[PDB]
């Protein structure tokens, strides 16, 4: 049941990896993976009904 | 001898699993798996000799 993931190696001395095994039945007990996703800001930065083309007039 | 089971993941950050190894000869020493079964309540809720059809009269 071992999970093997890679580290993003910052300062250097191949891919360096690390190992994780969950010891508990409840996912609440698990550490955080930090393997997170990003998304586009659009729902906040461009919430407009008609798609904005930045080279065009915002108002036409 | 490792047992690998899945967690029911509640709050989220594939299947997340966890590992279990028994360290002792006596099953009494083992932790609880919590991998339990359910059953129908009928032996308590419908203990009647003739099967009950709920849309029908209970007495005929």
């Amino acid at each position: 049941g071992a999970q093997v993931s890679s580290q993003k190696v910052g300062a250097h001395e191949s891919t360096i990896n690390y190992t994780t095994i969950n010891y508990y039945r409840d996912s609440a007990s698990n550490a955080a993976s930090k393997q997170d996703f990003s998304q586009d800001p659009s729902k906040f930065t461009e919430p407009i009904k008609d798609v904005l083309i930045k080279t065009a007039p915002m108002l036409n | 001898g490792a047992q690998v089971s899945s967690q029911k993941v509640g709050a989220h950050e594939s299947t997340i699993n966890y590992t279990t190894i028994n360290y002792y000869r006596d099953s009494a020493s083992n932790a609880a798996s919590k991998q339990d079964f359910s059953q129908d309540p009928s032996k308590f809720t419908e203990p009647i000799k003739d099967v009950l059809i709920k849309t029908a009269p209970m007495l005929n």
Partner: peptide
């Protein structure tokens, strides 16, 4: 066994 990410 082992998962790999």
């Amino acid at each position: 066994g082992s998962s790999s990410t």
